[PDB]
Write a protein that binds this DNA or RNA. Structure first.
Ligand SMILES: [Cl-]
Ligand code: NA
Lengths: 1295, 48
RNA sequence: UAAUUUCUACUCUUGUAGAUGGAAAUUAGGUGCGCUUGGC
DNA sequence: GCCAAGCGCACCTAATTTCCAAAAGGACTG
DNA sequence: CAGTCCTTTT
C-alpha cells in the first residue's frame, strides 16, 4: 500500500544559499589595486540614478497607448455578474477567459495589433515595442519615436556609463515586460485595468444608482462636489458613473482625479478641506435623522481606484516644502524663535488672558468646534460643558418644554459660538480657575521653549527630543489661541479681536514648522547597502558551464573539505585568459569543478535549430529541407513539416496538450508528438554539446503521453558535474599574478572550533558535492549566482572588556531563566557597577547565577564591524522530479484513506495565546495540548508585545522605529520546528484556521514552505528526510491567491463554532440576541422553553428547550439534538487537579453603564441571582415545581428581563477577564454521564482553556474532512464545512 | 402601463366602472416626506 | 548583557540550538503624527 | 475620549511577478 | 574581413 516515506521527490524546489567570501593570499590586495570595489559601487550608483530616467520612456509610451483605448465593458460586467450569481466552475472559467479577452484587447494597443486604430499607428506602436526591453533604450532611437524631448548632458553621461555593460539591465527588462504583459499577473497594466480597477468602478456605478434612486437629492449634492473641485467639467455626474467613462479612467492622471472626486482636496494645514463624495455621504449619515437611516441601509462609500502601474502620483492637495539639512531646521527655527521674542508674542498673550479677568465676557466668544476640546482640557469629561450649557438653556425656555424645543436647543449648541460668560455661569467657578492654570502652564512651557537653546545638530535622539519638546510647547499655545472665535458673525470686543488675531498670525507658522521638523526628523538614518560585484565582467557568475568559464569568470574548487570560489577578473591591461591544466590526482592542489549543462531542452533545442534566423528566413520563401552543419558532427536536416510543427499559424502547436484539449484530434496530437520527439533525438545525437550523452534510458517516442513527460526524463541527463585536480603551483601562481581571485566559500560550520550540528544550508552544500549526488543528481547547482560587497555598518566598540564578566540568562539549573527585571541589575552588580543596593529578589538569585570571565575579546555585531564579501548561489532540490507536481492532493488522500489511524494536529490562533496546538488521535481524543507563547524557556509573546509598544512609543517620540519581523521570524522558526517534529513523529495531518472566514498568516507561509522541502538534520542523506531525499508534505506553493482548502497534509477549516462549543456535547448557544430586544420578544422567548424546575438533589436549575421551538430567535443551526437541558449550575466551590479552588457555574459578563457603556467586566453567579429573584417575588421553588409560568404570570418587566439576562449569561460558555487571566469554558448542559464541562477542573484529557478548546475543534473539523474522505468514492476532499454539517457531525458523535 | 377596460374581459370581474382606460404607474422607489416630516419610499408594496 | 551568510534564542564549548529563496521590479496595506468637517 | 469620512508626511510589512543560461547573434575594433 | 566579447534569445 502507500507509505509516508513515499512523499519525496515529487517536485523540484529552488533555494538560494548565502555565504561569506574570504579572499586568499594577494586577492584582496589585487582587488584594491585594480579599483574593482569602487567601480562596482559606482555602477550601482549610476543604475539607481539612470533608472527613473529610463522609466520616463515606459510611462510616456504606456499613457500614449492608454489614452487611445476605447472598449465596451458590458460583456465583462456580465461575466462578473454571472459568476457572482451562480458560483460555479463554469461561470468562473467564463470570467477568466473574458478577462483574458479584455487583457489582450488592452495589450493590442501596446504591440500595435488593435483593429481600433489606423494601420500606420499600429506600425509606430509595433516599432517602439520591439525596442523597449533591450539596448535600444540607451541609444535614443526609442525616444526619437516617442516625443520631441531630448536628453540632458548629465543624462547622456549616465547612458554612456553603461557602454558595453547594458546587460546589467537584464532583470530590469524582465521587470518591465512584467508591466506590459497580457498575462494574468499582478505586475501588469492590463491586469490592473481589467481585474483590479474595472470591478471597483463597476461597483461604484451600482452604488451611485442605488443612492440617487432612494434619495434623489444626493444627485445634486454630488454634482456640486464635482463643480467645487473643478474636475470632469464636460462630463455629467451620471456619465462619471457609467461604463463608457471607464475608458477615460486608465491613465494615472485621470485615476487621481476620480479619487479626488471621491476623497476631496486639502490645502495648508488649518485651512478648511474641500469635501469629496465619501465625506458628503458620511456627514449625511451622521445627522442621525430619518434620511440618514435610509442612506446608511444602502452602500454609502465609493471605492477609490488603484494606481496605474509605474505611473507617477499627482495630487491637487497642497504638499509641504521639505527640510534638507539638520542645519536648515535649526537655523530656520532659531530665526523664527528669535523673531517671536522680538515680536513679544508671549507678553501680548499673557495680557490677553488677563483681560478675561475684567473685560465683559459677553463679547468674548468660544468657537463651537472647540467646545469639546476645552471640556476635555479644563473639565472632568468631554461632554461636561455641552451638558452644562444644554441644561442651563432648556431651563430658560417658556411654556411646555416639548421634545421639539429640547431638540432645537441641542442643534443650537452645534451651530452658534458661545460667550465665556454663559460657559462660566453654566459650569462652576472651577472652570475659571482651571483656565488660569492651563493658561499659565502653556505660557510657562512656551517661555521655557523660547529661552532654551537649540542643539548643534540632530544626530542624537536627545537633540531631536529638544527640538520636538519646544515645538510641542509652541503648538500648545497655537491650540489655546485657536479656542477663540474671531469671526465677525458675533459681536466680539474689537480690540480683543484685533490683538488676538495679531498673535495668531505670528503663531501660525508653528504648525507648518511642527510638520516640517517631524517630516524631516523621523527620516530613516542612512545605511550602507550591499552592492553587486562584477569585477568588470558583464555576465559574472551567469552560468557555471565549462564552455562559458571564459565569459563568466566563475569557477569552484574543493581542497581538503573546504570550498573555494575562483573569480577571473578582466584587469587593467592585456593578459592572456587563464586556463587550467589537469594533472595526476596524486599531485597536491585543488579539485576544480567541471560543470556540463544543456539548459531546458524545450527552449534550447529550437533555439539552436528550428528558430535559427537562417532557417526562419529560408522557410519564408522555400519549401525544401535545410541542412545545418555548424555545431553538428553530422548534418541536421530540418523539413517544412518540422518547422511548421514548432512555428504554427496560431497557437497551440500540434504536440501540446491544449491542442488535444481543443481540436480533439488525439490521432493528430500523437502523430506530431512522435515527429517532434524524434526530431529532438536527431538533434541531440548531432549537436556538439549533447552528441556524447548517453540517451539510452529514454523510451521510444510513441510511448510518451505528453511532451512534459518526455522533457522530465530527458533534462536530468543533460546535466553533469565532475572534478579534476589542478596543481597547487598553477593556482597559487595565478593568485600571485592576479589572473585569479580566490575566495574561501565560508560560513561558521567551517570554523576551526566548529564541533556541533551544521546549518541545514551547509547540509545542502556538502550534499550537493557528495559522491552519491555526483553519481545521481538529487541537488543541482544553478547559475545566476551573485557576489556582493557589504561595507561595515556598526562601529567596532568591543562588548567585552578584558576585566568584565558576562552573565548567563539562565541559572545554574541551565533551565530556569533570570527574570527580565533582574537581569540588568545583576549584570551591573557582578561587574561592580551598581550605583545602589541590590534588589532583595536579585540578592536571592545571586548565589545561583553563572558569570564568565572574558578570556578573549568578542565584539557585538562583529560581522558588521568589517567590510565583507558575500556570495549567493541558487540550487535546485529534487532535480529528478518535474518542475510541478501532478495531482499532489490525490496522492495524499489515497495515503489517508489507506491510513485511518492518522492523528491530527489542530493549530489555533488564540485570544490569550499567539499559537495553541492540540493533537488528537483518530478516535477524537487529545494526545497533547499546549500554548506556544513560551518556547525554549523564552516568552515570545511578552517580547513581541513589548517590542510593538516600543515601536509605537518610538513613532510618537520621533526616535528610530526599527523592525519586528526579525523577532517574529525568530519565534515562528521555533514554532515551525516543533510542528514539523510533531508531524513526523505522529505522521499527522495539520489543520489550520481559514483566515477568509499577523503571526498566524506569517506562520502559514513559513509552515507551507518548510513542508515543500523538509530535511531533518539528524537523518542520513540516503534516508527519506535526508538531504538527498527531502520530504514533501505540502503542495507546491505558488501564491496565496491560488491556494485551496487542502495543501497536501495541510488542511484549512472554518473558524466558527470551534471555541464557543462544549467539548463533551457539541452544544452551542443557539440564539441571536439581536432578535431579543423588546418586552414582547423577551416574553415569547421565555414561552419557548417547556419548563424551569429546581433539582433539590444537585441544587442546579434545569431549563428545558426543545430545538424544534422558538425558531424565530435561532441562528438556523438545529444541529443533531432535539432538546437540551440547560443547567444553572449551583454556585459551589470545586477544586482543580493542582488543588486550586474555583466557583462552579460562574460567569464573567461586561459591566454596563446606562444605555451602552462597557469598559470593565464583573463576576456573575446565575444560580444564586435566580434564587435572589425568586425569593424577592416569594415564588416557591424547592418543591421541584415549574417556575416559568409563575415568572410571567403577572408580566413583571424586571422579572422576565432579569431572567433573559441570566439565561443568556448561562449560555455564555466562554468567560474571560484579562485582568486575572481567566479564559475558561463552562458548559450549560450536562453530557451523557451527567457532567457539565468545566475547563477549570484542568483535566488533561480535555481542553484546559478556551483557546485549547479552539485548537481541539479545529483538529476535529479536520477529522470531519478525513471521515468524509474514507466514505467518499473519490480522492477529492469536500470544499468547506457548513456550520450545520459541523454541528450535526460533532453532536451525533458525542450523544 | 396603459390598460383599456374593454380588454382582458376574461380576467375581469364584469365591473367596467366609468373610465374606459387607466394609466397604471410603477412609481420610482424614491424617498418622500409626510406632513410630520417622516419619510417613506414611494410605490412600496408589502407582499405575502 | 557577547561571537552568526543572515535571523531568533543561547554560552559546557574561540562558539551552541533551531530556522533561513536570493536578486530585481511593482503594487497593496498598516502603525504614528498633523490637519478638515462632522457624531456621540 | 473615543469614533466617522478624508487629505499630507515619516517608516514598516507583505504579496506577487521575472530570472536562476548556453549559445545564437551581431556590434565593435584593428 | 576575422576575431572578440557584449547582447539577446529559445
Ligand atoms: Cl467560536
Ligand atoms: Na552549530
Amino acid at each position: 500500500m502507500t507509505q509516508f516515506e513515499g512523499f519525496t521527490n515529487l517536485y523540484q524546489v529552488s533555494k538560494t544559499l548565502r555565504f561569506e567570501l574570504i579572499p586568499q593570499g594577494k586577492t584582496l590586495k589585487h582587488i584594491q589595486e585594480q579599483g574593482f570595489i569602487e567601480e562596482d559601487k559606482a555602477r550601482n550608483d549610476h543604475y539607481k540614478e539612470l533608472k527613473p530616467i529610463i522609466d520616463r520612456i515606459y510611462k510616456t509610451y504606456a499613457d500614449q497607448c492608454l489614452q487611445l483605448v476605447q472598449l465596451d465593458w458590458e460583456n465583462l460586467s456580465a461575466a462578473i455578474d454571472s459568476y457572482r450569481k451562480e458560483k460555479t466552475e463554469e461561470t468562473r472559467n467564463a470570467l477568466i477567459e473574458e478577462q483574458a479577452t479584455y487583457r489582450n484587447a488592452i495589450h493590442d494597443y501596446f504591440i500595435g495589433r488593435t483593429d481600433n486604430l489606423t494601420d500606420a499607428i499600429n506600425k509606430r506602436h509595433a516599432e517602439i515595442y520591439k525596442g523597449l526591453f533591450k539596448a535600444e533604450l540607451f541609444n535614443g532611437k526609442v525616444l526619437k519615436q516617442l516625443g520631441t524631448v531630448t536628453t540632458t548632458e548629465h543624462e547622456n553621461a549616465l547612458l554612456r556609463s553603461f557602454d558595453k555593460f547594458t546587460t546589467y539591465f537584464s532583470g530590469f527588462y524582465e521587470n518591465r515586460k512584467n508591466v506590459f504583459s497580457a498575462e494574468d499577473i499582478s505586475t501588469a497594466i492590463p491586469h490592473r485595468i481589467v481585474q483590479d480597477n474595472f470591478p471597483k468602478f463597476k461597483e461604484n456605478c451600482h452604488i451611485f444608482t442605488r443612492l440617487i434612486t432612494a434619495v434623489p437629492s444626493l444627485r445634486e449634492h454630488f454634482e456640486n462636489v464635482k463643480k467645487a473641485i473643478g474636475i470632469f467639467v464636460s462630463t455629467s455626474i451620471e456619465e462619471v458613473f457609467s461604463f463608457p467613462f471607464y475608458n477615460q479612467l486608465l491613465t494615472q492622471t485621470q485615476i487621481d482625479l476620480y479619487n479626488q472626486l471621491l476623497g476631496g482636496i486639502s490645502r495648508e494645514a488649518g485651512t478648511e478641506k474641500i469635501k469629496g463624495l465619501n465625506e458628503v455621504l458620511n456627514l449625511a449619515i451622521q445627522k442621525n435623522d430619518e434620511t440618514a437611516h435610509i442612506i446608511a441601509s444602502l452602500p454609502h462609500r465609493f471605492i477609490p481606484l488603484f494606481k496605474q502601474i509605474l505611473s507617477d502620483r499627482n495630487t491637487l492637495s497642497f504638499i509641504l516644502e521639505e527640510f534638507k539639512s539638520d542645519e536648515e531646521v535649526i537655523q530656520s527655527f532659531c530665526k523664527y524663535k528669535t523673531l517671536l521674542r522680538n515680536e513679544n508674542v508671549l507678553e501680548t498673550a499673557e495680557a490677553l488672558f488677563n483681560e478675561l479677568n475684567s473685560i465683559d465676557l459677553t463679547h468674548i466668544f468660544i468657537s463651537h468646534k472647540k467646545l469639546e476640546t476645552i471640556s476635555s482640557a479644563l473639565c472632568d469629561h468631554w461632554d461636561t460643558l455641552r451638558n452644562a450649557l444644554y441644561e442651563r438653556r432648556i431651563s430658560e425656555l417658556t411654556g411646555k418644554i416639548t421634545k421639539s424645543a429640547k431638540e432645537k436647543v441641542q442643534r443650537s449648541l452645534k451651530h452658534e459660538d458661545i460667550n465665556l460668560q454663559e460657559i462660566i455661569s453654566a459650569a462652576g467657578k472651577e472652570l475659571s480657575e482651571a483656565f488660569k492654570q492651563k493658561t499659565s502652564e502653556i505660557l510657562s512651557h512656551a517661555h521655557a521653549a523660547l529661552d532654551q537653546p537649540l542643539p548643534t545638530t540632530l544626530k542624537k535622539q536627545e537633540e531631536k527630543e529638544i527640538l520636538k519638546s519646544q515645538l510641542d510647547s509652541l503648538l500648545g499655545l497655537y491650540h489655546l489661541l485657536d479656542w477663540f472665535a474671531v469671526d465677525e458673525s458675533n459681536e466680539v470686543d474689537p480690540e480683543f479681536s484685533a490683538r488676538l488675531t495679531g498673535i495668531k498670525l505670528e503663531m501660525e507658522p508653528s504648525l507648518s514648522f511642527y510638520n516640517k521638523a517631524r517630516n524631516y526628523a523621523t527620516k530613516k538614518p542612512y545605511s550602507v547597502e550591499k552592492f553587486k560585484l562584477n569585477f568588470q565582467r558583464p555576465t559574472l557568475a551567469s552560468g557555471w558551464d565549462v564552455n562559458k568559464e571564459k565569459n563568466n569568470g566563475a569557477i569552484l574548487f574543493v581542497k581538503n573539505g573546504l570550498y573555494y570560489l575562483g573569480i577571473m577578473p578582466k584587469q587593467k591591461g592585456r593578459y592572456k585568459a587563464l586556463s587550467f591544466e589537469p594533472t595526476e590526482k596524486t599531485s597536491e592542489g585543488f579539485d576544480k569543478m567541471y560543470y556540463d549543462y544543456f539548459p531546458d531542452a524545450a527552449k534550447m533545442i529550437p533555439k539552436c535549430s528550428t528558430q535559427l534566423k537562417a532557417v526562419t528566413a529560408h522557410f519564408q520563401t522555400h519549401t525544401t529541407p535545410i541542412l545545418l552543419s555548424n555545431n553538428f558532427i553530422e548534418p541536421l536536416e530540418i523539413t517544412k513539416e518540422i518547422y511548421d510543427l514548432n512555428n504554427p499559424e496560431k497557437e497551440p502547436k500540434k504536440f501540446q496538450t491544449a491542442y488535444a484539449k481543443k481540436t480533439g484530434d488525439q490521432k493528430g496530437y500523437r502523430e506530431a508528438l512522435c515527429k517532434w520527439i524524434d526530431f529532438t533525438r536527431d538533434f541531440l545525437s548531432k549537436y556538439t554539446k549533447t552528441t556524447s550523452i548517453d540517451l539510452s534510458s529514454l523510451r521510444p517516442s510513441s510511448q510518451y503521453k505528453d511532451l512534459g513527460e518526455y522533457y522530465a526524463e530527458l533534462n536530468p541527463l543533460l546535466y553533469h558535474i565532475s572534478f579534476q585536480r589542478i596543481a597547487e603551483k598553477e593556482i597559487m601562481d595565478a593568485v600571485e599574478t592576479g589572473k585569479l581571485y580566490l575566495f574561501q566559500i565560508y560560513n561558521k560550520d567551517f570554523a576551526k572550533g566548529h564541533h556541533g550540528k551544521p546549518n541545514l544550508h551547509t547540509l545542502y552544500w556538502t550534499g550537493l558535492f557528495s559522491p552519491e549526488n555526483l553519481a545521481k543528481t538529487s541537488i543541482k547547482l544553478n547559475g545566476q549566482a551573485e557576489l556582493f560587497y557589504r561595507p561595515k555598518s556598526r562601529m567596532k566598540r568591543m562588548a567585552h572588556r578584558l576585566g568584565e564578566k558576562m552573565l548567563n540568562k539562565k541559572l545554574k539549573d541551565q533551565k530556569t531563566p533570570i527574570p527580565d527585571t533582574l537581569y540588568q541589575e545583576l549584570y551591573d552588580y557582578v561587574n561592580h557597577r551598581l550605583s545602589h543596593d541590590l534588589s532583595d529578589e536579585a540578592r536571592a538569585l545571586l548565589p545561583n547565577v553563572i558569570t564568565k570571565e572574558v578570556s578573549h575579546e568578542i565584539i557585538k555585531d562583529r560581522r558588521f564591524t568589517s567590510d565583507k564579501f558575500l556570495f549567493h548561489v541558487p540550487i535546485t532540490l529534487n532535480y529528478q522530479a518535474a518542475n510541478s507536481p501532478s495531482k499532489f492532493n490525490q496522492r495524499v488522500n489515497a495515503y489517508l484513506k489507506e491510513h485511518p489511524e492518522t492523528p491530527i494536529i489542530g493549530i489555533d490562533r488564540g485570544e490569550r495565546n499567539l499559537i495553541y496546538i492540540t493533537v488528537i488521535d483518530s478516535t477524537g481524543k487529545i494526545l497533547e495540548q499546549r500554548s506556544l507563547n513560551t518556547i525554549q524557556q523564552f516568552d515570545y509573546q511578552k517580547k513581541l508585545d513589548n517590542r510593538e509598544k516600543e515601536r509605537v512609543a518610538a513613532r510618537q517620540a520621533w526616535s528610530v522605529v526599527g523592525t519586528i519581523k526579525d523577532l517574529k521570524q525568530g519565534y515562528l522558526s521555533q514554532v515551525i520546528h516543533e510542528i514539523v517534529d510533531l508531524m513526523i513523529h505522529y505522521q499527522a495531518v495539520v489543520v489550520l484556521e481559514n483566515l477568509n472566514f499577523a503571526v498566524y498568516q506569517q506562520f502559514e507561509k513559513m509552515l507551507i514552505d518548510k513542508l515543500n522541502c523538509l530535511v531533518l538534520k539528524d537523518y542520513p542523506a540516503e534516508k527519506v528526510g535526508g538531504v538527498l531525499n527531502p520530504y514533501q508534505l505540502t503542495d507546491q506553493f505558488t501564491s496565496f491567491a491560488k491556494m485551496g482548502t487542502q495543501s497536501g497534509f495541510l488542511f484549512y477549516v472554518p473558524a466558527p463554532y470551534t471555541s464557543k462549543i462544549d467539548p463533551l456535547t457539541g452544544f452551542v448557544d443557539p440564539f441571536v440576541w439581536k432578535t431579543i430586544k423588546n418586552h414582547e420578544s423577551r416574553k415569547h422567548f421565555l414561552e419557548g422553553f417547556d419548563f424551569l424546575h429546581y433539582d433539590v438533589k444537585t441544587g442546579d436549575f434545569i431549563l428545558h428547550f426543545k430545538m424544534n421551538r422558538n425558531l424565530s430567535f435561532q441562528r438556523g443551526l438545529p444541529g443533531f439534538m432535539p432538546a437540551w437541558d440547560i443547567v444553572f449550575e449551583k454556585n459551589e466551590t470545586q477544586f482543580d487537579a493542582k488543588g486550586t479552588p474555583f466557583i462552579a457555574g460562574k460567569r464573567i459578563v461586561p459591566v454596563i453603564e446606562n444605555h451602552r457603556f462597557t469598559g470593565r467586566y464583573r463576576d456573575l453567579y446565575p444560580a444564586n441571582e435566580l434564587i435572589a429573584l425568586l425569593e424577592e417575588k416569594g415564588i416557591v421553588f424547592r418543591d421541584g415545581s415549574n417556575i416559568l409560568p409563575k415568572l410571567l404570570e403577572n408580566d413583571d418587566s424586571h422579572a422576565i428581563d432579569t431572567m433573559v439576562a441570566l439565561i443568556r449569561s448561562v449560555l455564555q460558555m466562554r468567560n474571560s477577564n484579562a485582568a486575572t487571566g481567566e479564559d475558561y469554558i463552562n458548559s450549560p448542559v450536562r453530557d451523557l454521564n451527567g457532567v457539565c464541562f468545566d475547563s477549570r477542573f484542568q483535566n488533561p484529557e480535555w481542553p484546559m482553556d478556551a483557546d485549547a478548546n479552539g485548537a481541539y475543534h479545529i483538529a476535529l473539523k479536520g477529522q470531519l474532512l478525513l471521515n468524509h474522505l474514507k466514505e467518499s468514492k473519490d480522492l477529492k476532499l469536500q470544499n468547506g464545512i457548513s456550520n450545520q454539517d459541523w454541528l450535526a457531525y460533532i453532536q451525533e458523535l458525542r450523544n
